[PDB]
Design a protein around this ligand. Structure first.
Ligand code: FAD
Ligand code: FAD
Ligand code: HEM
Ligand code: HEM
Ligand code: HEM
Ligand code: HEM
Ligand code: LMT
Ligand code: LMT
Ligand code: SF4
Ligand code: F3S
Ligand code: FES
Ligand code: NA
Lengths: 254, 655, 239, 254, 55
């Protein structure tokens, strides 16, 4: 605590007698972290889906992220730093966005009742945002820690192993719908919240953003389910008890 | 006992009351505004036509000034107005517009260029010069040669009301809504405040003040068909009347609007016919040209209403389960025109009539619209009961006489608010009152006893059946056309209705938030108001302005160049007491003559009018020859008073 | 005929100790161009004079009759029974406002409080002489101000807002719109920093979660979505 | 939504005109779930520490939880159900307790300032409760999911593998302090919140509960660190690239 | 000018003023008690000896 923070806590204003600018900064950062995660996830879905193009394809993509063009067989630790960074933004975002949850019985009851009475699309979608957000506290953390601590186990073979043998598929299936619904709705609300594309016909822009939101979600969900099946199918074929699948892909170029 | 004190008490939160409150509050007088509803929901908010003021900014306003506005007002009133008051008004209207502009009212502005306009005598092109650009615009409204009606697109009353209400909030005026004045506190011929009923809690409270101003609006809801909000029941009028001292002026002077939507009464702006709207009958026949070959659809609103009723009486009306009506065809203006210049009217017919005006015709019928009558005051706005002031539609300051000009009423509300506001402020600051608790207790206890009796009444009459019968009687017998036989019948039935209202019984016994109890005390009040209207109409044997007696078709300047004054001195009497205040032609800047609209030579000339006229022509000529300005000439003809703050002249484009 | 309508109304008298919140049903025969205004008055005059509700203009201009009609805050005087293919209409008072009784709530005083909170009036150093020509204003500017000045303080956007329902100190869509209305008025001299001192906090613009229910129910169709975003961009950039 | 929930949302009371009993029930369940987790953790620390008594010891204990005395070599799926149950309580508790976090800038600033000005032990301890609670959203979820999906990988050998080779030690080290601080403070506050042991000399009881809280924490932290070292040491000795440590313990009795 | 009315005005919020206020308020008289400080902080609060009464 500093003298200034004490003066602000007790007076409600800064030493210059103005309202704190912190609420503004927090609003900015909540949206910034949200935007980062939303875009990151889109790219994430494309890279992880390379499995549909063949093992050699995703294997090649995987080696690039490990800085193949700078290190021998690439260093998996690169992905560890990448994962750590995204984990930090994940936590920062959850911390800031959490401020928006209904926080007591009264708020929960009245909002839930209002949502059901209104049958208003964008209000209902916010509820989904909140629900999926809360769920990811548990689902997302599991995946992020593993990617950060076991980067050398990423590959067309090793990833399929974790998917099936380590029973990660149930978590991935749920997380898939959770993050895609959360992500697309979030990017959409971000657009209308800050009005970056409003222009001269705001209502038309919004109508288009809503359509784009639905298409993006549908496409990414389908692509996500196909990619899911791919990893699952391969994982179900790993029946050789003498083969170390978990570290197979790594045991190719160190 | 509960008592609230303030230096200035304002009853009514419309344009007039709020503006008067600004006047008193800005000079340090603690002021309270009482209102039945949140002030921004007052009827004033519904005005869409505009506000009349001689700015002279636009091309069609070029050359306009106080004199032209003054003449339109006087002639429009059919000489029933106090011309000195009309002068105070026209000279102040320009500053009301300008003050409101400074307060942020978004008046539509003029842009340089040509524009496709309808003159209905030469629907040509109008050009606005560069020096007019950015100034307050004006449109054709009220039938005045000079277009001086200012507006904020299609919601003038709304933006005006919000600005004045916001100014009251800025100044710290105490706004107390869901509060109803049910009686005035008075003693020795002086008003010390009002007994108020809190509509939410049911508490009876005495609001005492050095001065009390009533700005409660009109009394149109005594009629079944009206354009007025459901709160325009004239209770403010009634409480003044029930003091037995304050008088009501020209209550029989009621103005109707020709094209309200039927049967709701929701208004379809004058701009419809002004643009090219066509009136049709049961056969789809355009009938106005038949009665008015020249003016046709564009005749005086006063004339259109009469023709419409005449046409219906000839059996050409459209039959409906709600009564007979006519049609308003605006589709002929083209869907394009309607959705760009009448987008508002289109929404009305859809949201309520459930029809697309660009395709189907709207049912219409003339209905009660404005109340020229009201609480009688002197030029300062003070009533016979000292300390009681009135402004706005609730008053009979009488700048309207027997026919208010379209656009002059929202203008009056603000202007009177300013002027009466000054005199009211002066009274509150300089007067000293003797508040006796004995008197306060008598009035408060008297109303608490009244509320209790209503709740305990074992009467068997139904308040709603009585109120609804009153409204039918008013519509059937005290409308556009009146005759002695029917008026006599109306008065007798209203009197009988009044007696029965005292035997009302209500189901809900609670004292708080009880709409049924509210009707129980309001209805008897409305009946006394209705009686003043009907009886005043019966006794006035002449046709003047909006008051048309089929059995006395001529304007009688010999016997009826006066103002009806109604009072109710004895609480036991069942009929109002009527007296008359004669208008002195000697104090008229404009002697009685042809009003401009309607049949010519339809008035019984008064020899004194001719004398005064000659006297006027003489004074003008002499002074005019001596190279005297219109201001000096005006003073010589009829000097009038104005509070110091508003004595200045109005600068105009071109001086 | 005209089909039979089933009107279900919320009834509760907080000032009466024995009153309990409940629904009451009425059977009303529909008629041509029938509105909730007509329905409620029919009920009052012939079936139940106890019922509280507020109407004034009955023309959708004053903002007095807002209420929840089948889950949506709407103006009762502008709502047609015809639009309910089912014949069942449920009426609730507007949430987020203090209840007086039944369908009557106190919107007026909350709004006056809001108007004072955002200082809803022209702020100018000098008073313009009212006996002189008015200051010139571009017609386009006057039109823009008018667009936002059309708000009738009906409260529908306040009651439609899940954020307001949960957090009562939230200034609401109407309050954010009011700030912009003065922001774009050349007559008002306040700067962005001045406005920040009014709504630059979590009870203000940063408290909005962009649910957009306000925009979708506003009976006057104000451009709330783009105007609130406009305000948010400006307030987040202060300093 | 039901008619009753609508009436309660709009009136603030139940159809009988009484205040909802839900706040009471939620308070009860928040404490109940907290108590369960607190006790569970104490037992958890003792069973996981059996590694200090020898591989055969913990191995024997591990087989018992898999219902050794009912199934051949015991079924690991038993631990999966156990983990699932605890995960559910974990989530339910976090959901309820989350209601108590400072939820906006003002609350956060004023409380933080107050905490620093006051230098009041029990207030500062609540802050620690909140901080450790938020942190466990991410830390606890990782561990719980793995125990639930890979129960057959629990053992003196397999557990040490995950500890070191799969880099779970950094998470365990932090989670150890987080859950122990959170747990002990929580059990303590639970006692004074409900006053189960107040008796006739409340101040003495509280003074004793505070001492017990500190001792319990110290003991369990030490025991936790020793057990930590044990798993780490063993994990660092698994250098045979031809041995499948992850499933070693399982490959002993199916 | 600011004016506040009540049937019974009590100046002083100690034992005597508050007890007199109870007397007037219980019979429907609107009453106001004015005090320099919150009434429960009046000097009356310091009495520790006791109250004399012939029970
Ligand atoms: C009805 C109407 C009138 C109208 C118009 C359109 C319609 C639909 N268009 C107009 C136009 O374009 N140009 C014009 O010049 N006039 C137009 N008018 C008529 C005009 O709007 C009115 O004359 C004017 O608005 C009247 O203002 P005023 O300030 O006098 O009154 P108000 O707005 O009706 O408000 C009355 C207030 O009184 C309160 N009240 C009433 N009774 C009581 C009691 N007993 N106790 C306490 N308060 C009371 C009301 O609540 C209200 O606030
Ligand atoms: C000082 C004292 C007195 C005392 C005592 C111990 C002490 C330290 N012990 C007593 C005991 O054991 N037995 C006993 O019989 N008497 C004892 N006393 C004396 C006794 O307490 C006092 O006589 C008694 O309490 C007096 O009561 P009273 O109701 O008269 O007055 P008060 O409590 O002092 O309160 C005065 C109120 O007046 C307000 N005030 C004062 N001036 C103004 C102005 N100008 N405007 C508005 N309000 C005003 C004060 O704020 C207060 O509320
Ligand atoms: C990869 C993971 C995540 C992605 C892609 C993501 C993305 C987004 C986006 C784009 C927004 C819009 C932010 C804004 O409007 O300013 C948003 C909102 C939100 N997110 Fe996330 N999020 C993620 C994880 C989480 C988590 C773990 C939580 C848990 C607390 C969470 C809770 C919320 C909530 C409640 C909102 C609404 C905030 C508001 O209404 O202002 N998010 N998120
Ligand atoms: C830099 C961090 C991340 C990396 C390196 C990464 C990497 C991967 C990889 C390699 C897979 C394939 C399966 C496997 O190997 O186990 C995968 C799948 C998945 N990831 Fe991530 N991920 C990251 C962050 C995230 C985040 C933040 C989320 C959402 C909260 C997420 C959600 C998913 C989902 C749902 C799948 C399943 C894909 C499908 O089946 O369609 N990932 N990730
Ligand atoms: C094994 C894990 C956990 C254990 C042992 C545990 C245990 C406890 C205990 C014993 C209490 C006392 C509850 C009461 O006073 O009614 C408590 C309080 C609390 N816990 Fe946890 N908890 C765990 C995980 C979490 C998580 C994941 C969160 C995250 C939101 C959390 C947040 C809280 C908070 C904020 C409180 C204070 C509640 C209040 O002040 O009423 N806990 N916990
Ligand atoms: C039924 C559920 C649980 C089971 C079956 C379980 C099992 C185990 C096992 C076998 C280990 C040893 C290392 C390993 O095998 O990876 C361990 C360690 C650990 N567990 Fe759990 N656990 C459970 C729940 C929890 C919970 C809810 C928490 C706290 C949120 C927790 C915190 C820890 C910690 C901190 C360690 C490290 C011990 C040390 O190094 O001293 N566990 N657990
Ligand atoms: C959807 C994710 C929620 C985001 C997290 C933050 C908001 C929710 C937690 C804070 C408010 C506490 O919320 C409180 O939870 C309990 C659940 O035990 C709800 O309890 C009610 O709903 C649950 C779930 O449908 C029912 O099983 C239960 O019978 C019912 O009484 C309370 O009505 C709610 O008010
Ligand atoms: C400790 C766990 C917290 C429990 C989670 C719920 C409460 C906290 C989140 C809701 C309130 C938001 O809290 C808000 O966070 C930001 C962090 O970016 C703080 O920001 C302040 O502290 C952080 C951390 O010391 C500094 O890096 C930052 O420079 C400073 O301005 C705000 O002062 C706080 O009000
Ligand atoms: S912004 Fe729209 S919904 Fe909100 S108060 Fe104004 S008019 Fe009503
Ligand atoms: S609904 Fe409420 S959350 Fe913001 S977008 Fe409108 S004010
Ligand atoms: S009664 Fe005025 S908007 Fe409905
Ligand atoms: Na009048």
């Amino acid at each position: 605590m500093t003298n200034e923070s004490i003066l602000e806590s007790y007076s409600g204003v800064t030493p210059e007698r103005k309202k704190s600018r912190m609420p503004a900064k927090l609003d900015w950062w909540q949206s910034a972290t949200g935007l980062f995660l939303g875009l990151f996830m889109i790219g994430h879905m494309f890279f992880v889906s390379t499995i549909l193009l063949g093992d050699n394809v995703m294997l090649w993509v995987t080696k690039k992220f490990e800085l193949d063009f700078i290190f021998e067989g690439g260093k998996p630790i690169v992905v560890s730093f990448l994962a750590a960074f995204v984990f930090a933004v994940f936590i920062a975002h959850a911390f800031l966005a959490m401020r928006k949850f209904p926080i007591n019985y009264r708020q929960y009851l009245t909002f839930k009742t209002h949502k059901d009475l209104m049958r208003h699309g964008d209000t209902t979608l916010w509820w989904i945002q909140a629900m999926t957000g809360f769920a990811m506290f548990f689902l997302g953390s599991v995946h992020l820690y593993i990617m950060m601590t076991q980067p050398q186990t990423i590959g067309p073979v090793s990833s399929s192993f974790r998917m099936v043998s380590e029973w990660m598929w149930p978590l991935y299936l749920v997380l898939l719908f959770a993050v895609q619904l959360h992500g697309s709705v979030g990017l959409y609300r971000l657009a209308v919240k800050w009005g970056w594309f409003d222009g001269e016909t705001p209502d038309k822009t919004r109508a288009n953003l809503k359509k784009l939101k639905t298409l993006m979600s549908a496409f990414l969900i389908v692509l996500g389910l196909l990619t899911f099946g791919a990893y699952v199918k391969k994982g179900l074929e790993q029946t050789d008890p003498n083969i170390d699948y978990k570290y197979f892909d790594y045991k190719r170029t160190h | 006992m509960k008592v609230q004190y303030c230096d200035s008490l304002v009853i009514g939160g419309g344009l007039a009351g709020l503006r008067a409150a600004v006047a008193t509050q800005q000079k340090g007088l603690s002021t309270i505004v009482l209102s039945l509803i949140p002030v921004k929901r007052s009827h004033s908010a519904a005005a869409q036509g505009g506000m009349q003021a001689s700015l002279g900014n636009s091309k069609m306003s070029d050359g306009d000034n106080e004199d032209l506005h003054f003449m339109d007002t006087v002639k429009g009133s059919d000489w029933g107005c106090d011309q000195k008051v009309a002068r105070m008004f026209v000279n102040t209207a320009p500053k009301a517009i300008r003050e409101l502009a400074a307060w942020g009212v978004p008046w539509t502005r003029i842009h340089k260029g040509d524009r496709m306009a309808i003159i209905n005598a030469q629907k040509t092109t109008i050009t606005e010069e560069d020096f007019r650009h950015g100034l307050i615009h004006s449109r054709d409204f009220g039938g005045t040669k000079k277009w001086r009606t200012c507006y904020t697109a299609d919601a003038t009353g709304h933006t005006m009301l919000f600005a004045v209400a916001n100014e009251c909030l800025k100044l710290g005026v105490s706004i107390q809504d869901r509060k109803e004045a049910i009686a005035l506190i008075h003693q020795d011929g002086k008003c010390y405040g009002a007994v108020v009923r809190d509509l939410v809690t049911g508490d009876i409270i005495a609001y005492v003040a050095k001065g009390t101003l009533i700005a409660t609006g009109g009394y149109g809801r005594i009629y079944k068909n009206t354009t007025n909000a459901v709160v325009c029941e004239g209770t403010g009028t009634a409480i003044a009347l029930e003091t037995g001292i304050a008088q009501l002026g020209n209550m029989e002077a009621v103005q109707f609007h020709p094209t309200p939507l039927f049967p709701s009464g929701i208004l379809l702006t004058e701009g419809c016919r002004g643009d090219g709207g066509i009136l049709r009958d049961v056969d789809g026949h355009r009938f106005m040209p038949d009665y008015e070959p020249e003016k046709k659809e564009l005749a005086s609103r006063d004339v259109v209403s009469r023709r419409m009723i005449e046409h219906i009486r000839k059996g050409k009306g459209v039959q409906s389960p709600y009564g007979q009506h006519l049609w308003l065809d605006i589709s002929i203006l083209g869907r394009k025109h309607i959705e760009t210049n009448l987008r508002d009217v289109q929404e009305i017919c859809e949201y309520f009539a459930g029809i697309d005006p660009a395709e189907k015709w709207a049912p219409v019928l003339p209905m009660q619209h404005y109340s020229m009558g009201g609480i009688r005051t002197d030029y300062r706005g003070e009533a016979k009961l000292k300390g009681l002031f009135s402004a706005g539609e609730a008053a009979c300051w009488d700048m309207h006489g027997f026919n208010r000009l379209g656009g002059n009423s929202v203008s009056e509300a603000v202007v009177a608010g300013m002027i009466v506001g000054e005199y009211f402020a002066e009274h509150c600051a300089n007067t000293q009152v003797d508040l006796e608790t004995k008197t306060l207790e008598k009035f408060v206890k008297g109303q608490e006893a009244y509320m209790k009796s209503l709740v305990e009444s074992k009467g068997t009459e139904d308040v709603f059946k009585i109120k609804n019968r009153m409204k039918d009687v008013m519509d059937d017998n005290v409308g556009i056309f009146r005759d002695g036989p029917h008026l006599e019948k109306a008065v007798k039935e209203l009197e009988e209705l009044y007696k029965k209202s005292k035997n009302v019984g209500i189901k809900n016994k609670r004292l708080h938030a009880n709409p049924e109890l509210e009707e129980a005390y309001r209805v008897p009040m409305m009946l006394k108001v209705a009686l003043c209207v009907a009886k005043g109409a019966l006794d006035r044997t002449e046709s003047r302005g909006a008051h048309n007696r089929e059995d006395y078709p001529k304007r009688d300047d010999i016997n009826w160049l006066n103002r009806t004054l109604a009072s109710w001195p004895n609480p036991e009497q069942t009929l109002p007491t009527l007296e008359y205040e004669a208008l002195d032609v000697n104090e008229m800047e404009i002697a009685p003559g042809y009003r401009g609209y309607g049949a010519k030579g339809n008035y019984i000339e008064n020899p004194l009018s001719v004398k005064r006229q000659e006297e006027i022509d003489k004074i003008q000529s002499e002074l005019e020859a001596a190279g005297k300005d219109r201001h000096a000439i005006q003073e010589a003809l009829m000097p009038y008073e104005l509070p110091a703050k508003y004595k200045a002249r109005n600068e105009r484009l071109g001086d | 005929m005209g089909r039979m309508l089933t009107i279900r109304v919320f009834k509760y008298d907080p000032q009466s100790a024995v009153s309990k919140p409940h629904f009451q049903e009425y059977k009303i025969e529909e008629a041509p161009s029938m509105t909730i205004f007509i329905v409620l008055n029919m009920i009052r005059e012939t079936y139940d004079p106890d019922l509280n509700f507020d109407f004034v203009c009955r023309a959708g201009i004053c903002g007095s009759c807002g209420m929840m009609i089948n889950g949506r805050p709407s103006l009762a005087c502008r709502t047609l029974t015809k639009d309910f293919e089912d014949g069942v209409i449920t009426l609730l008072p507007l949430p987020a406002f203090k209840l007086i009784k039944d369908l009557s709530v106190d919107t007026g005083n909350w709004f006056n409080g809001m108007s004072q909170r955002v200082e809803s009036w022209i702020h100018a150093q000098k008073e313009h002489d009212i006996s002189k020509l008015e200051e010139r204003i571009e017609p386009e500017v006057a039109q823009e101000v008018f667009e936002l000045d059309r708000c009738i303080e009906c409260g529908c956007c306040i009651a439609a807002c899940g954020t307001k329902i949960m957090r009562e100190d939230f200034v609401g869509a109407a309050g954010l719109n009011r700030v912009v209305r003065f922001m774009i008025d050349p007559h008002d001299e306040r700067t962005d920093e001045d406005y920040y001192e009014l709504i630059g906090d979590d009870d203000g613009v940063f408290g909005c979660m962009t649910l957009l229910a306000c925009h979708d129910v506003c009976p006057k169709n104000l451009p709330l979505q783009s105007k609130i975003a406009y305000l948010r961009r400006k307030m987040v950039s202060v300093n």
